[PDB]
Structure formats: C-alpha cells, structure tokens
Amino acid sequence: TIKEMPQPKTFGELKNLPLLNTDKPVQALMKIADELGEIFKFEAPGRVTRYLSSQRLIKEACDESRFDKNLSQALKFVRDFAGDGLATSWTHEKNWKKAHNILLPSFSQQAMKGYHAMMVDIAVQLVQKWERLNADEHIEVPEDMTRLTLDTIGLCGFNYRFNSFYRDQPHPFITSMVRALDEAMNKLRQFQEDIKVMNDLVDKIIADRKASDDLLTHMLNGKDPETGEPLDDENIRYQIITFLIAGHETTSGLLSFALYFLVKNPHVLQKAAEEAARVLVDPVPSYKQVKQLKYVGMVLNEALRLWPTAPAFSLYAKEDTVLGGEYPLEKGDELMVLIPQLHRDKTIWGDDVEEFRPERFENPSAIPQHAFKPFGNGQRACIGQQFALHEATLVLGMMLKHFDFEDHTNYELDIKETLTLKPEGFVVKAKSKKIPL
Ligand code: HEM
Numbered sequence: 001t002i003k004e005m006p007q008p009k010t011f012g013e014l015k016n017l018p019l020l021n022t023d024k025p026v027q028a029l030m031k032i033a034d035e036l037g038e039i040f041k042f043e044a045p046g047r048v049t050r051y052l053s054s055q056r057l058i059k060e061a062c063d064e065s066r067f068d069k070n071l072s073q074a075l076k077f078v079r080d081f082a083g084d085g086l087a088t089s090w091t092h093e094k095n096w097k098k099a100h101n102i103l104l105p106s107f108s109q110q111a112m113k114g115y116h117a118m119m120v121d122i123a124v125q126l127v128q129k130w131e132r133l134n135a136d137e138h139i140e141v142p143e144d145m146t147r148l149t150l151d152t153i154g155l156c157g158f159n160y161r162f163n164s165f166y167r168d169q170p171h172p173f174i175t176s177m178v179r180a181l182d183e184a185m186n187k188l189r190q191f192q193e194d195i196k197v198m199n200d201l202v203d204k205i206i207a208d209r210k211a212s213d214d215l216l217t218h219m220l221n222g223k224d225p226e227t228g229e230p231l232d233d234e235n236i237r238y239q240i241i242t243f244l245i246a247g248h249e250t251t252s253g254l255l256s257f258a259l260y261f262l263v264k265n266p267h268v269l270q271k272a273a274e275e276a277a278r279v280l281v282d283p284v285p286s287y288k289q290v291k292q293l294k295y296v297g298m299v300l301n302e303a304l305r306l307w308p309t310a311p312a313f314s315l316y317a318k319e320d321t322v323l324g325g326e327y328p329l330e331k332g333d334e335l336m337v338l339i340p341q342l343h344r345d346k347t348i349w350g351d352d353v354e355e356f357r358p359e360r361f362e363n364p365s366a367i368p369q370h371a372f373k374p375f376g377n378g379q380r381a382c383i384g385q386q387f388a389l390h391e392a393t394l395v396l397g398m399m400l401k402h403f404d405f406e407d408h409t410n411y412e413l414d415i416k417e418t419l420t421l422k423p424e425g426f427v428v429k430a431k432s433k434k435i436p437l
C-alpha cells in the first residue's frame with residue numbers, strides 16, 4: 001500500500017524553492033527533515049528531489065543494482081569548471097572509468113607510504129607556525145587547516161608548493177575557489193574571472209612538471225589497462241582542478257570540526273593527547289605510528305558523524321521501483337542522501353546522537369552497513385578517503401603531542417556552507433608543550 005510522501009510548504013510556481021533562501025541550505029534542510037521525518041519531497045521549477053534521512057531508506061538507496069550516482073544540480077554547476085573530472089562525471093561517461101583506472105595506482109598503499117614524508121613536511125610547517133606565535137596572538141583554525149590541506153595535496157599530488165604558510169591572505173587559487181563554489185551554491189564577470197585564476201595555475205603545474213612519481217605523473221603518463229589509452233589534455237586539466245579542490249576542502253573542514261569537538265570535550269581531548277604522547281615517541285610521526293593512533297582515528301570518524309564535511313550525495317533510480325516498500329519512484333528520480341541526518345538516526349546510534357563520543361567507533365564492525373557514509377557510496381565513493389584520514393590523523397596527532405589548547409573566546413559554533421561545511425570564526429590559543437621536532 002502506497003504512502004504519499006511529505007513535502008514542506010509550497011509557494012506557487014516557485015514550489016519549495018523559497019524555503020532555501022538562506023546562506024545555510026543544508027542546515028535548513030536538516031530542520032525540514034526533523035519536522036518531516038525520513039523522507040520528504042522537495043520541488044523547484046523543473047526540478048524534483050527526494051531527501052532521505054534514515055539508515056533504513058538510505059541502505060536501499062546505496063544498492064548499486066538499483067541506484068547510480070546522480071549529478072546533483074550542485075555538481076552540475078561544479079562541472080562548469082571541473083568538467084568530466086572524476087567527481088563530476090556520470091558513471092558511464094567514457095572518462096569516469098578511464099580516469100578511475102589510470103588514477104587508482106596513486107591511492108595504492110605504496111603511494112600512501114610515499115606521500116607520508118610530504119604530509120609530514122606540511123604538518124611540520126603548521127606546528128612551527130603555532131610554536132612561533134607570540135603570547136598575545138591566537139589561531140584562526142579553518143584558515144590554517146586550509147593552508148595545511150591545500151599545501152598537502154599540492155605537494156603530494158603535483159610536487160607544487162602553494163607556500164600557504166608564507167602568505168597572510170589565502171593563495172589566489174583559494175580566493176577564486178571559494179567564490180566559484182559560493183556562486184554554485186547561490187545559483188541553486190566574476191564567475192568567469194574565478195575560473196580564469198584556477199586555470200592559470202593548472203598550466204603552471206603542468207609546465208613546471210615539463211621541467212624534469214605522484215598523482216600528476218599518473219595523470220600525464222598512465223594508460224588505461226582496458227585500452228592502453230592515456231587521458232587526453234583537456235581531461236587531465238579537469239582532473240588537476242578536481243583533485244585540487246576535492247583534495248583539500250573537506251579535509252580542512254574535518255580537521256576544524258575535530259579540533260572544535262576536542263576543545264568542547266576536554267576529557268576526550270585528554271584521552272587523545274595521552275595516545276599521541278604515548279605513540280609519537282619520535283621527532284616526527286612515522287607511517288606506522290600514524291596507523292597506531294586508534295583513538296585519534298575514532299575522534300575523526302565521530303567528527304565526520306556529527307558534521308560530515310561533504311554533507312550530501314545524490315542518486316537516481318535506474319528503473320521504475322519502490323523505495324522502502326512504500327514510495328514508488330520513476331526511472332531517473334533523484335534521491336538526495338542527507339548525511340548529517342543519517343548520522344543522527346537514533347535507531348542506529350541510540351538516543352545520545354548529539355554527544356561527541358569517539359568510543360562509538362571502537363568496534364567498527366558493530367556499525368550497520370550504510371549507517372556511516374561520510375565518503376559516499378560504492379564504486380563512486382571517495383577515492384581520497386585513505387589519503388584524507390592519514391593526513392588528518394597525522395596532523396591531529398602532532399597537534400595533540402605539541403600543544404595544549406584554550407577556547408579563549410568560548411566559541412559558539414557557526415557553520416559556514418559553501419558546498420562543504422566548516423566552522424566559521426573558530427579561533428583558539430595554543431600553548432606549546434615545548435617538544436621540538
Ligand atoms: C574528510 C575528507 C573528505 C570527505 C568527507 C570526502 C567525501 C566525498 C564524498 C561524499 C564523495 C562522493 C560524492 C558523490 O557521491 O557525489 C567523494 C568523492 C570523491 N573524492 Fe572525496 N572526500 C574527502 C577527501 C578527499 C581527498 C583528500 C581527495 C583527493 C586526494 C578526494 C577526492 C575525491 C574524488 C576525486 C571523488 C570522486 C570519486 C569518483 O566518483 O570517482 N576527496 N568524496
């Protein structure tokens with residue numbers, strides 16, 4: 001027996017569009033889901049989406065025999081500059097599978113071990129910056145995390161040094177990036193100007209490589225095993241842009257939210273700092289030591305639980321079907337996975353879903369399939385997941401070895417939305433524990 005699905009207030013021809021007249025549309029949607037439950041329809045003029053919030057409905061949506069990745073209207077706007085890069089391609093677009101096969105080697109275990117020294121390079125630059133602040137100074141958390149994470153993918157991926165810690169404002173490329181991503185969010189000469197800046201740097205990266213084993217090596221020289229074709233010049237440049245953005249933005253948000261939760265939960269911070277001091281006995285962390293930071297890894301997952309920094313991903317029905325035994329869908333219908341709501345499903349997590357308890361992740365085998373999805377789903381899941389988590393674990397472990405932290409402003413959480421989530425205005429003071437590196 002068919003259920004009629006909930007839908008918020010409509011506004012004539014504009015349908016539900018005016019309900020997201022806000023700088024914080026994901027957070028607005030979360031409130032709608034709190035009101036309406038596990039599924040609601042959301043309409044705009046010539047656009048329909050179904051927003052899902054329960055693990056029960058989301059686990060069905062994650063059945064790849066039945067649903068494939070959709071390019072949401074957001075990703076459609078990002079495609080204006082990222083083209084048919086890996087994140088903004090259809091699964092059966094020729095360059096998706098092709099680029100996937102060519103670029104997988106760059107996220108192998110050998111690649112990761114290879115990346116570790118270069119991650120350590122940038123993490124050291126972060127710790128040094130904070131060791132070198134005067135007594136009266138404070139830290140702009142998301143701003144420095146963005147310095148760290150941009151520099152890390154730049155170095156590891158492309159052997160290009162943005163030198164973000166050498167500049168008092170964001171790198172040109174970031175300023176243009178935040179502006180294009182804010183445009184794409186709002187849209188739902190400046191936009192062509194932002195893309196100008198982005199694309200000028202891509203050329204500088206390729207040209208610099210022309211002056212002679214990483215992501216770019218593979219982009220430029222790897223051949224698809226299925227065909228022996230390498231990527232073409234246009235796609236490669238879409239990939240560089242893709243990896244530059246995807247490779248830093250969400251990670252910077254994760255490290256920010258993580259430090260936020262640690263300072264708001266000082267006993268959790270204590271427990272994480274004890275592991276860091278215990279494991280990290282050497283001047284910098286080894287690849288192996290980072291893997292030994294179990295509790296620090298649990299801290300990051302819990303942070304991704306509460307505030308998944310890529311808040312949504314979108315699917316379409318491969319055929320006419322029924323979702324949840326109740327809601328008929330037509331072939332092509334878009335389902336949007338509302339990750340922060342999934343992650344607050346009390347039937348999965350218990351009633352204490354707002355509490356920051358990394359101990360939830362102690363026995364990750366206790367977590368039901370499709371309960372925890374900060375990195376997307378299936379064959380289109382995040383290719384950089386291990387990269388992001390090793391980076392964040394490394395860095396957070398080093399922050400916890402080197403500094404005691406003070407929430408000197410009693411910061412009230414304010415989540416800025418671009419397409420990703422980040423704490424805005426998060427500031428702390430860090431007091432060095434005086435251990436050299
Ligand atoms: C904590 C940090 C990260 C989060 C939460 C995250 C999240 C996600 C999500 C949800 C998707 C799927 C998007 C969709 O279904 O439309 C995705 C895909 C992707 N991510 Fe990540 N990501 C992170 C870090 C990274 C890093 C560090 C890289 C690069 C080194 C990266 C590169 C990509 C790429 C290229 C895709 C598209 C993969 C494909 O569809 O073939 N991401 N990520």
Ligand SMILES: [Zn+2]
Pocket residue numbers: 068091092
């Ligand atoms: Zn398919």
Ligand SMILES: [Zn+2]
Pocket residue numbers: 105213214217218
């Ligand atoms: Zn290689």
Ligand SMILES: [Zn+2]
Pocket residue numbers: 320330331
């Ligand atoms: Zn049909």
